[PDB]
Design a protein around this motif. Structure first.
Motif, PDB file in Angstrom:
ATOM      1  N   UNK A   6       0.759  -1.221   0.082  1.00 10.93           N
ATOM      2  CA  UNK A   6       0.097  -0.138  -0.323  1.00 10.93           C
ATOM      3  C   UNK A   6       0.952   1.394  -0.212  1.00 10.93           C
ATOM      4  N   UNK A   7       1.758   1.312   1.000  1.00 13.06           N
ATOM      5  CA  UNK A   7       2.723   2.226   0.712  1.00 13.06           C
ATOM      6  C   UNK A   7       3.604   2.926  -0.344  1.00 13.06           C
ATOM      7  N   UNK A   8       4.034   1.667  -1.299  1.00 16.10           N
ATOM      8  CA  UNK A   8       4.597   2.146  -2.323  1.00 16.10           C
ATOM      9  C   UNK A   8       3.812   2.832  -3.492  1.00 16.10           C
ATOM     10  N   UNK A   9       2.684   2.029  -3.545  1.00  9.57           N
ATOM     11  CA  UNK A   9       1.398   2.520  -4.059  1.00  9.57           C
ATOM     12  C   UNK A   9       1.046   3.921  -3.860  1.00  9.57           C
ATOM     13  N   UNK A  10       0.905   4.413  -2.838  1.00 11.23           N
ATOM     14  CA  UNK A  10       0.658   5.820  -2.325  1.00 11.23           C
ATOM     15  C   UNK A  10       1.885   6.718  -2.588  1.00 11.23           C
ATOM     16  N   UNK A  11       3.177   6.074  -2.253  1.00 11.18           N
ATOM     17  CA  UNK A  11       4.386   6.936  -2.631  1.00 11.18           C
ATOM     18  C   UNK A  11       4.605   7.247  -4.057  1.00 11.18           C
ATOM     19  N   UNK A  12       4.125   6.293  -4.879  1.00 12.37           N
ATOM     20  CA  UNK A  12       4.364   6.489  -6.402  1.00 12.37           C
ATOM     21  C   UNK A  12       3.010   7.458  -6.914  1.00 12.37           C
ATOM     22  N   UNK A  13       2.010   7.224  -6.375  1.00 13.60           N
ATOM     23  CA  UNK A  13       0.566   7.961  -6.939  1.00 13.60           C
ATOM     24  C   UNK A  13       0.719   9.333  -6.406  1.00 13.60           C
ATOM     25  N   UNK A  14       1.304   9.635  -5.493  1.00 11.37           N
ATOM     26  CA  UNK A  14       1.418  11.009  -4.962  1.00 11.37           C
ATOM     27  C   UNK A  14       2.714  11.597  -4.922  1.00 11.37           C
ATOM     28  N   UNK A  15       3.796  11.282  -5.013  1.00 12.05           N
ATOM     29  CA  UNK A  15       5.371  11.643  -4.939  1.00 12.05           C
ATOM     30  C   UNK A  15       5.900  11.846  -3.763  1.00 12.05           C
ATOM     31  N   UNK A  16       7.136  12.464  -3.395  1.00 11.04           N
ATOM     32  CA  UNK A  16       7.547  12.633  -2.153  1.00 11.04           C
ATOM     33  C   UNK A  16       7.095  13.993  -1.475  1.00 11.04           C
ATOM     34  N   UNK A  18       4.020  15.820  -1.537  1.00 17.72           N
ATOM     35  CA  UNK A  18       3.189  15.495  -0.883  1.00 17.72           C
ATOM     36  C   UNK A  18       2.836  14.293   0.048  1.00 17.72           C
ATOM     37  N   UNK A  19       3.529  13.392  -0.480  1.00 13.61           N
ATOM     38  CA  UNK A  19       3.772  12.012   0.446  1.00 13.61           C
ATOM     39  C   UNK A  19       4.210  12.866   1.877  1.00 13.61           C
ATOM     40  N   UNK A  20       5.281  12.869   1.954  1.00 11.08           N
ATOM     41  CA  UNK A  20       5.785  13.520   3.350  1.00 11.08           C
ATOM     42  C   UNK A  20       4.869  14.430   3.929  1.00 11.08           C
ATOM     43  N   UNK A  21       4.180  15.451   3.275  1.00 11.24           N
ATOM     44  CA  UNK A  21       3.230  16.543   3.549  1.00 11.24           C
ATOM     45  C   UNK A  21       2.161  15.966   4.190  1.00 11.24           C
ATOM     46  N   UNK A  22       1.490  14.888   3.889  1.00 14.40           N
ATOM     47  CA  UNK A  22       0.452  14.363   4.282  1.00 14.40           C
ATOM     48  C   UNK A  22       0.775  13.516   5.743  1.00 14.40           C
ATOM     49  N   UNK A  23       1.724  12.860   5.444  1.00 15.23           N
ATOM     50  CA  UNK A  23       2.138  11.879   6.383  1.00 15.23           C
ATOM     51  C   UNK A  23       2.609  12.722   7.615  1.00 15.23           C
ATOM     52  N   UNK A  46       9.177   6.748   7.332  1.00 16.47           N
ATOM     53  CA  UNK A  46       8.102   6.343   6.405  1.00 16.47           C
ATOM     54  C   UNK A  46       8.378   6.468   5.216  1.00 16.47           C
ATOM     55  N   UNK A  47       9.020   7.696   4.931  1.00 21.34           N
ATOM     56  CA  UNK A  47       9.694   8.219   3.785  1.00 21.34           C
ATOM     57  C   UNK A  47      10.879   7.447   3.281  1.00 21.34           C
ATOM     58  N   UNK A  48      11.384   6.883   4.420  1.00 16.71           N
ATOM     59  CA  UNK A  48      12.492   5.802   3.883  1.00 16.71           C
ATOM     60  C   UNK A  48      12.043   4.754   3.080  1.00 16.71           C
ATOM     61  N   UNK A  49      11.289   4.052   3.902  1.00 13.85           N
ATOM     62  CA  UNK A  49      10.646   2.937   3.385  1.00 13.85           C
ATOM     63  C   UNK A  49       9.910   2.977   1.999  1.00 13.85           C
ATOM     64  N   UNK A  50       9.013   3.929   1.958  1.00 11.69           N
ATOM     65  CA  UNK A  50       8.550   3.948   0.666  1.00 11.69           C
ATOM     66  C   UNK A  50       9.310   3.853  -0.478  1.00 11.69           C
ATOM     67  N   UNK A  51      10.637   4.654  -0.199  1.00 16.19           N
ATOM     68  CA  UNK A  51      11.592   4.315  -1.604  1.00 16.19           C
ATOM     69  C   UNK A  51      12.060   2.752  -1.439  1.00 16.19           C
ATOM     70  N   UNK A  52      12.615   2.453  -0.108  1.00 19.30           N
ATOM     71  CA  UNK A  52      12.870   0.887  -0.258  1.00 19.30           C
ATOM     72  C   UNK A  52      12.055   0.168  -0.924  1.00 19.30           C
ATOM     73  N   UNK A  53      10.625   0.436  -0.868  1.00 18.46           N
ATOM     74  CA  UNK A  53       9.536  -0.355  -1.485  1.00 18.46           C
ATOM     75  C   UNK A  53       9.487  -0.106  -2.969  1.00 18.46           C
ATOM     76  N   UNK A  54       9.405   1.055  -3.439  1.00 17.09           N
ATOM     77  CA  UNK A  54       9.585   1.537  -4.829  1.00 17.09           C
ATOM     78  C   UNK A  54      10.679   0.689  -5.337  1.00 17.09           C
ATOM     79  N   UNK A  55      11.743   0.699  -4.600  1.00 21.23           N
ATOM     80  CA  UNK A  55      12.850  -0.063  -4.828  1.00 21.23           C
ATOM     81  C   UNK A  55      12.626  -1.673  -4.884  1.00 21.23           C
ATOM     82  N   UNK A  61       7.862  -6.302   5.459  1.00 23.56           N
ATOM     83  CA  UNK A  61       6.992  -5.431   5.927  1.00 23.56           C
ATOM     84  C   UNK A  61       6.468  -4.375   5.022  1.00 23.56           C
ATOM     85  N   UNK A  62       6.963  -4.429   3.656  1.00 24.39           N
ATOM     86  CA  UNK A  62       6.293  -3.481   2.486  1.00 24.39           C
ATOM     87  C   UNK A  62       4.878  -3.768   2.345  1.00 24.39           C
ATOM     88  N   UNK A  63       4.651  -4.976   2.894  1.00 27.62           N
ATOM     89  CA  UNK A  63       3.433  -5.746   2.433  1.00 27.62           C
ATOM     90  C   UNK A  63       2.255  -5.309   3.762  1.00 27.62           C
TER      91      UNK A  63
END
Ligand code: PRO
Ligand code: PRO
Ligand code: PRO
Length: 583
Positions: A6-16, A18-23, A46-55, A61-63
């Motif tokens: 869910x997180x990588x999905x939100x990170x992609x669909x939002x970018x960094x 706004x992602x950070x902003x909302x978090x 949680x910004x760390x991870x979202x990259x880890x997970x786009x990666x 846990x990405x799950x």
């Protein structure tokens, strides 16, 4: 809608950004009391991870679900301030009661310092670290208004940022931004007040209440739409609002952008007024849409009586599919009457329902409801006498003087309500007069009646925390639709027993001399209320007297050389002057 993550999905669909902003906006809203530093730490993680997970999405846990990570990296890492009589304990419990706990500690009156914009300082923090400055506007705001609609906050943080970007080059910084952040501050407070009504509707009142409001709102803006596509928008738009209230903020945003797109794919069957908004960037887009000007009332539309008063099937329809028939009534009525306020429109859908209920079991229903629309036109008579009568009082006294009159009303209406609240509420009603009484009356009713709906709701959520006045609980609880009328009727609670006299409520100091105008007035108006609470029966004349002496005295003492000493010397006099003199 499930994913590898869910997180990588939100990170992609939002970018960094706004992602950070909302978090950060989530944390600031949960933990309203932890300083900004700590927050940004957690956002980076949680910004760390979202990259880890786009990666790599398959990573441990990405799950897990979004409540999960927000929880673990908020809770077990720093179990922040158990001191919260609330917060400490939820910590160790799991999905999804733990998060369920988290939300419910949100505080609606967290009493942090009210920050007054100082330009030179502000310009400076903007030059020092432009991104912190933006993060702090979020944290500062979000932490004061834990239900602020998150995406709409981001768009506001970028506007504030555009003012400093425009203004700090100038030599008089002040004459540049002060104004620009003033009328902006209002926009943000009305935004906050408007999404708390949403949230409070969904909760005390059922989500159906929410859709009804939205259905009126949109049927004015998109008068040329079908009922089906309006219902489709109001359908997803409510899911959006639903998530935001539910803290699924990231979901909330991604989902608000889809709805904005969807709205732009169909801008054709919606309005020939969305093309500006429909090519602007993401957030400007959503702000623009919600706020677009009401399209034109379509041509040559059947009289309302055709389906709501002469049609023979009326009672059948009403009986077979109540909501449907009624939403349709609401749509058909709103798209024909843009000059109306959403609040009024619902009293009218409600009244038309009352009439159906009544006639559909009389023997000749049609004779009974045939005239309904002529009745309906008149229900608007009251909310327009009300506004007319309150405007004149305002233009007469001007704003402060209006506020001070509202203070006497509301204190007499709900004396058990705490003083900060009578003061807060009494001050926002006052302002509506500034905001509306000059409006053409085709924008007025909407103006006035809309705000009152937002101010009263504020009244309601403050009160229901620490209930004190029964009439208010009633007004707050019975019908979301009739609230404004309810509260307006309130007469002086004859049950009330006076506060026992107290010198401190009339003790004054020389800070009054020096404070900004807002803090000064709140000081005076706080005194007014306490005066009332202690003598409720008191004649208006007696008050005028009493205010008049306080004034003269703040003058004689603000002009003094030794200001405080004065306040120490005549102070008593004015106390004594008040008690026996107007006892
Ligand atoms: O990749 C996926 O599976 C998501 C689920 C909805 C459509 N796309
Ligand atoms: O104009 C029409 O044809 C419809 C008939 C009922 C009322 N208006
Ligand atoms: O302030 C006054 O004037 C009254 C007289 C007795 C007690 N206080």
């Amino acid at each position: 809608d499930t994913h590898k993550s869910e997180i990588a999905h939100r990170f992609n669909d939002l970018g960094e950004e706004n992602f950070q902003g909302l978090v950060l906006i989530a944390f600031s809203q949960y933990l309203q009391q932890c300083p900004f530093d700590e927050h940004v730490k957690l956002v980076k993680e949680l910004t760390e991870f979202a990259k880890t997970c786009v990666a790599d999405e398959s990573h441990a846990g990405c799950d897990k679900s979004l409540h999960t990570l927000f929880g673990d990296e908020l809770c077990k890492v720093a179990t922040l301030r158990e001191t919260y009589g609330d917060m400490a304990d939820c910590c160790e419990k799991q999905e999804p009661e733990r998060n369920e706990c988290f939300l419910n500690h949100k505080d609606d009156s967290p009493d942090l310092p009210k920050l007054k914009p100082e330009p030179d300082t502000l310009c400076a923090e903007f030059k020092a670290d432009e991104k912190k400055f933006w993060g702090k506007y979020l944290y500062e705001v979000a932490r004061r208004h834990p239900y602020f609609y998150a995406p709409e906050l981001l768009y506001y943080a970028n506007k504030y940022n555009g003012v400093f970007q425009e203004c700090c080059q100038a030599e008089d910084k002040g004459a540049c931004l002060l104004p620009k952040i003033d009328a902006m501050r209002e926009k943000v407070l009305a935004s906050s007040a408007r999404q708390r009504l949403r949230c409070a509707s969904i909760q005390k009142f059922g989500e159906r209440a929410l859709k009804a409001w939205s259905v009126a709102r949109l049927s004015q803006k998109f008068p040329k739409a079908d009922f089906t596509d309006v219902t489709k928008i109001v359908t997803d738009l409510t899911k959006v609002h639903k998530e935001c209230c539910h803290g699924d903020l990231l979901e909330c945003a991604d989902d608000r952008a889809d709805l904005a797109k969807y709205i732009c794919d169909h801008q054709d069957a919606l309005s020939s007024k969305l093309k500006e908004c429909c090519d602007k960037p993401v957030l400007e887009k959503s702000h623009c849409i919600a706020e677009v000007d009401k399209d034109a009332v379509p041509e040559n539309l059947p009289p309302l009586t055709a389906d709501f008063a002469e049609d023979k099937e009326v009672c059948k329809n009403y009986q077979e599919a109540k909501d449907v028939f009624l939403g349709s009534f609401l749509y058909e009525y709103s798209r024909r009457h843009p000059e109306y306020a959403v609040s009024v429109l619902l009293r009218l859908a409600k009244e038309y329902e009352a009439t159906l209920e009544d006639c559909c079991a009389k023997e000749d229903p049609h004779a009974c409801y045939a005239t309904v629309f002529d009745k309906l036109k008149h229900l608007v008579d009251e909310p327009q006498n009300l506004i007319k009568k309150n405007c004149e009082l305002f233009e007469k006294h001007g704003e402060y003087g209006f506020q001070n009159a509202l203070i006497v009303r509301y204190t007499r209406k709900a004396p058990q309500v705490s003083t900060p609240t009578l003061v807060e509420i009494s001050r926002s009603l006052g302002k509506v007069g500034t905001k509306c009484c000059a409006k053409p009356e085709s924008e007025r009713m909407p103006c006035t009646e809309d705000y009152l709906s937002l101010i009263l709701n504020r009244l309601c959520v403050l009160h229901e925390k620490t209930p004190v006045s029964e009439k208010v609980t009633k007004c707050c609880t019975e019908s979301l639709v009739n609230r404004r009328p309810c509260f307006s009727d309130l007469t002086l609670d004859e049950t009330y027993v006076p506060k026992p006299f107290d010198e401190k409520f009339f003790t004054f100091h020389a800070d009054i001399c020096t404070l900004p105008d807002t803090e000064k007035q709140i000081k005076k108006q706080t005194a007014l209320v306490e005066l009332l609470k202690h003598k409720p029966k008191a004649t208006d004349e007696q008050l005028k007297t009493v205010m008049e002496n306080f004034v003269a005295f703040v003058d004689k003492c603000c002009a003094a050389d030794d200001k405080e000493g004065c306040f120490v010397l005549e102070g008593p006099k004015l106390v004594a002057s008040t008690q026996a003199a107007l006892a």
